[PDB]
Design a protein around this ligand. Sequence first.
Ligand SMILES: O=P(O)(O)C[C@H](O)Cn1cncn1
Ligand SMILES: O=P(O)(O)C[C@H](O)Cn1cncn1
Ligand SMILES: O=P(O)(O)C[C@H](O)Cn1cncn1
Ligand SMILES: O=P(O)(O)C[C@H](O)Cn1cncn1
Ligand SMILES: O=P(O)(O)C[C@H](O)Cn1cncn1
Ligand SMILES: O=P(O)(O)C[C@H](O)Cn1cncn1
Ligand SMILES: [Mn+2]
Ligand SMILES: [Mn+2]
Ligand SMILES: [Mn+2]
Ligand SMILES: [Mn+2]
Ligand SMILES: [Mn+2]
Ligand SMILES: [Mn+2]
Ligand SMILES: [Mn+2]
Ligand SMILES: [Mn+2]
Ligand SMILES: [Mn+2]
Ligand SMILES: [Mn+2]
Ligand SMILES: [Mn+2]
Ligand SMILES: [Mn+2]
Lengths: 212, 212, 212, 212, 212, 212
Amino acid sequence: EQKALVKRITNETKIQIAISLKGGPLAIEHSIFPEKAEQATQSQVINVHTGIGFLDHMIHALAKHSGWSLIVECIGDLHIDDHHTTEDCGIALGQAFKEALGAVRGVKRFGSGFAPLDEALSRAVVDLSNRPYAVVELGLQREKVGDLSCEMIPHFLESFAEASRITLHVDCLRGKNDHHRSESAFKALAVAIREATSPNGTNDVPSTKGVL
Amino acid sequence: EQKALVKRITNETKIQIAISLKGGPLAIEHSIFPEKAEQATQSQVINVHTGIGFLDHMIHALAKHSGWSLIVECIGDLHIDDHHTTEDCGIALGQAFKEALGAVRGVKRFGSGFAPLDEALSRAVVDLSNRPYAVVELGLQREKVGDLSCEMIPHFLESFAEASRITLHVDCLRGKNDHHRSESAFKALAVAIREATSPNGTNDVPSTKGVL
Amino acid sequence: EQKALVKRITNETKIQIAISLKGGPLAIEHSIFPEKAEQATQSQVINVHTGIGFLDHMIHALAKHSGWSLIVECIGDLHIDDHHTTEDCGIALGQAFKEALGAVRGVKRFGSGFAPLDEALSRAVVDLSNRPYAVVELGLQREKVGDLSCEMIPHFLESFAEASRITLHVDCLRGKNDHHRSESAFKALAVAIREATSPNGTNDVPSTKGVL
Amino acid sequence: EQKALVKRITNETKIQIAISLKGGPLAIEHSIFPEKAEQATQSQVINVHTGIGFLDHMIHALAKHSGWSLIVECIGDLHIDDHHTTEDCGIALGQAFKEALGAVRGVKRFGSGFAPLDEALSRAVVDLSNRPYAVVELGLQREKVGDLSCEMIPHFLESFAEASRITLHVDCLRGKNDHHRSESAFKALAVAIREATSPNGTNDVPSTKGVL
Amino acid sequence: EQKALVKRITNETKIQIAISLKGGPLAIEHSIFPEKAEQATQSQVINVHTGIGFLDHMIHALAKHSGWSLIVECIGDLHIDDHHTTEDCGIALGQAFKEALGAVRGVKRFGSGFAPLDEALSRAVVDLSNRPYAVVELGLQREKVGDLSCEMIPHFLESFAEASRITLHVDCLRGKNDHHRSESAFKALAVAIREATSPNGTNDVPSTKGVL
Amino acid sequence: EQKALVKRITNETKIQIAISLKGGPLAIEHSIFPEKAEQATQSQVINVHTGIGFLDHMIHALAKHSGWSLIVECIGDLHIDDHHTTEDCGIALGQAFKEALGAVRGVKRFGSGFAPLDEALSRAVVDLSNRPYAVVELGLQREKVGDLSCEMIPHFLESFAEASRITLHVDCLRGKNDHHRSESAFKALAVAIREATSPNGTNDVPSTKGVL
Ligand SMILES: O=P(O)(O)C[C@H](O)Cn1cncn1
Ligand SMILES: O=P(O)(O)C[C@H](O)Cn1cncn1
Ligand SMILES: O=P(O)(O)C[C@H](O)Cn1cncn1
Ligand SMILES: O=P(O)(O)C[C@H](O)Cn1cncn1
Ligand SMILES: O=P(O)(O)C[C@H](O)Cn1cncn1
Ligand SMILES: O=P(O)(O)C[C@H](O)Cn1cncn1
Ligand SMILES: [Mn+2]
Ligand SMILES: [Mn+2]
Ligand SMILES: [Mn+2]
Ligand SMILES: [Mn+2]
Ligand SMILES: [Mn+2]
Ligand SMILES: [Mn+2]
Ligand SMILES: [Mn+2]
Ligand SMILES: [Mn+2]
Ligand SMILES: [Mn+2]
Ligand SMILES: [Mn+2]
Ligand SMILES: [Mn+2]
Ligand SMILES: [Mn+2]
């Protein structure tokens, strides 16, 4: 039902993102890697292959705790820094989430998610209203985690909310380990998207202005 | 099932509030306006007519995201300021919510709701315990929004929790637009009341002292 | 050549914006006002009719110093405050500017405009790159100007850059009259859009990634 | 289904804790008190008998709003202070919660609970991941409540998360009555455990590393 | 006598740790590296092979000054950062130390160790009491040492005390070289474990509550 | 017309820079790489090959928005840090710009360029007067971007203005992403050089002292 595939091709990166919000299986009929963080345990299949290993782990923890099936492919330039291949892999990952739920009606529209990870604590609220907005206040006192440049972790969530047309407030409340502090943000966003995209029932677009 | 009508008549305002917490249709057999923010889309009907237009919009966003059907009619004095017609239209709107749920049993009793609106972020918790309390910390750096006097927006929620016999903590966490900051508070309260008045199941009054 | 008409219809406002970036004449074949800030001096015709008079004057000064022909018709709710009829009349005014220039190629792409107005000084830079962004730092120490609520003046430029897919930095450098301070911002944006949408020549999309 | 009994016997205290997470009835076939806060209203039976009366009331409010059936029997030394009989009655109460849910799979894994009590406001998040952690920031400006020594209230929740192998962040946001401030923390933890131990469905261990 | 082998297998790392607290020789009958910091000088054999070279050097200096024989084999994911292969190689290294001394009786139970390294000075106290605790206050003003991410150095000792069920206070008193500051912490812990696990004599469990 | 080739050969780096300020095609008759950021779209050809990938991207964005055709070949020592191959490389790129415009007459002589990039804002002014000067105030709170050492980004523009005999003030006004903050500086310099080297007309050396 809620499936989409997005092939975003620019002169910096080549993207192919297939998503399924309700879970289940996924494949790719024609991949972009030559010769055709991976969890495939019979309910959801999530297999992310970007050039950045720590940014694979954040999309993986996002889709594991959202109930998503998600295949991410990215052939990006890594002789240059990791900005152009994290910003572009967040724009196309917001578009795949946007096309997978067309009609915003019959949903809760408001998800809030707290998630801890071992003294770090992050909340994420999400709004699903067609104006994009992103208030990402991860206070990270590190310059690079393993390959992510640690200022792209807010910039990923900035472009995710931008291209998915959602309003997003992610704020890490405490923590002093920045693997812990950044993974808890993606685990908190996974709780909020799961709560906002939910069967409200009664089949009504949840807005005053009637347009979502 | 959960319906109530409250006709509050004083020498300052005349009120008639009909509410339905489970949604559905509503009408008035004998209105107070002469010759007999309006959403009527087949699941819930919410039609608020106070003399204040911005206070219409806050009760509307409250009832739209609560699943309520709600008709509000307030004939109040507006040659004087808007205090006497916002305080009185919040006392009677807490009484209509109170009479619509008589027995507080089989409910979650604890609703917490975060709701953003475009860089503003408000949380609201609600308690449904028969002592009234209201801790409303909307930090509004404006004097009037469109017709509300912007200090009545906490005073509305003060008298709502007062006359509905609930404990309420509404706190705007961030934001620098006070339409955004005050509407997100009413959208957050709508999530919390929806979560506290919920089918817990097992038919038990959720209290240590056994009285709610 | 560079003309567009946008009819944005929601349950709060009804909009009809016809724009011509190269100037010249404009009309409307079927208007939204019943029975069919106005400058019509033989080179460009600019006629803005919103319910807010001071927001008419800011779109007028924007289109007068941009070389635009622009007709704006907004039927919005004014018994509620002026947010819903200024935000919506900025989203549709960014969409009309976006559809009027389809191919961003052969343009300067970078406009910077300083404009004074009688001790106020505002600069505006504009980027014409398909990610929207808005950094609007008008320091206004007023609550309402004549009918605008003076926090909507940054919120107008926020939604203009949002729906037009441009990056925008507007910053008032000095000034202590907020009519002067806000009009100089719209006069500075008019210089920047005029400078960014300009005949660069040589017919090339001005980007590293080749996509604009 | 989710039942466990823990008999923890040391030279300071003797403990016997029988728990049922899904509610229902409970008894003890051979008690530790001589000759064989009590709620027994036909859905859940919660009967706590420690030597500390205020620590009875906090385990009672924890199990009342969690849906638990819980019998606590602690024979501890009270001629010495109340540390050794509150720390030990929290270690065994985390072990009884741990043995009552063996397989952490098919659960939400992330519960967040806000709960007010009459100007006090506490949130509690819980993680159900097999590393124990406890960040308890109840700001209590009292030395003893009725018999608890008011620094054991964080030390109880420290040893509860320690022996139950969960990660826990309990933080009182406001309040100036420390009965209110400490009871709202246990009422907030009751919402979070109820939300984390919940039927997620689809029968999958919710972790990246696959081990919970 | 005091030997243990721990094979910890998760979907992130595969661990095999063989320890001997009294020294002597050690081998592995079936290793995890393909085709079958190393000191093997006739009294103790210590051979650590993790993917991190600086974390090899800290376990090596820990076991060299403890009298241990210790073989560490960790096959961990290093395309992601080094957190998951340092946290997991500290949990299994606390479990191997825990299983190597079963009965905590006849031991000093309290080891304190100061160790300098060239203007750095660290103390470490250790408690061997079955509640785990870790207060690690290495003040490191570096982000990465050679491959360790320099916030994992406290996180290693956190999970070591966690899984070994010991209470641990490691605090660097001075120093301005963070190789020196972190190696002196592991050399100080080696003095403390050597002092706590020591032949007290008289064969008695050293506790008031009689249970260790 | 405005073409130059500079082959700078030292014992640290070997450079070959061919430039064309008016655009058009460029080739190299005898390259320095064995066996003979690249944009070649029919108007200008820009192909930079230094050992640093992020410094390729900054010369590329400089020449893309200047109208330049530019081939850069730098064979530099990278077992040592990147200073000697970014400085050396900046000196020869100022000399190639200097030899490409011999007679400074008939030009505007004063270019100012603002350029944003996604909350970063940089201005650059340029003077084309034969005393070199460089006031570069990029406030970068990072140590390395991808391969550039992030203090060489001002040191590149220092040596560019030094060897090109121009006066240069580059100042980033805001921004909190240092890829954004440093790329906007090179995009702002591209606007300023384009504006200073411009057909003023009337064929006069624009100076009081008559010598440029
Ligand atoms: O958020 P909505 O669309 O449900 C109705 C809002 O009132 C529209 N809005 C946009 N800014 C402030 N309000
Ligand atoms: O809130 P309840 O009624 O469930 C039981 C409370 O303990 C009563 N109370 C009122 N103030 C402090 N406690
Ligand atoms: O701005 P562009 O598209 O010309 C190339 C940029 O490098 C892309 N980008 C986006 N963020 C940082 N860089
Ligand atoms: O929390 P998990 O087990 O779901 C996967 C985590 O990434 C493991 N971890 C432990 N510290 C940081 N991460
Ligand atoms: O540490 P022990 O077990 O020797 C006896 C302690 O008194 C127990 N305890 C735990 N917290 C405070 N005391
Ligand atoms: O800048 P010029 O050469 O046009 C004339 C200047 O006055 C020369 N100068 C150099 N320092 C101060 N003035
Ligand atoms: Mn970017
Ligand atoms: Mn992780
Ligand atoms: Mn009042
Ligand atoms: Mn509104
Ligand atoms: Mn708005
Ligand atoms: Mn004016
Ligand atoms: Mn204790
Ligand atoms: Mn109480
Ligand atoms: Mn960890
Ligand atoms: Mn060393
Ligand atoms: Mn130098
Ligand atoms: Mn870039």
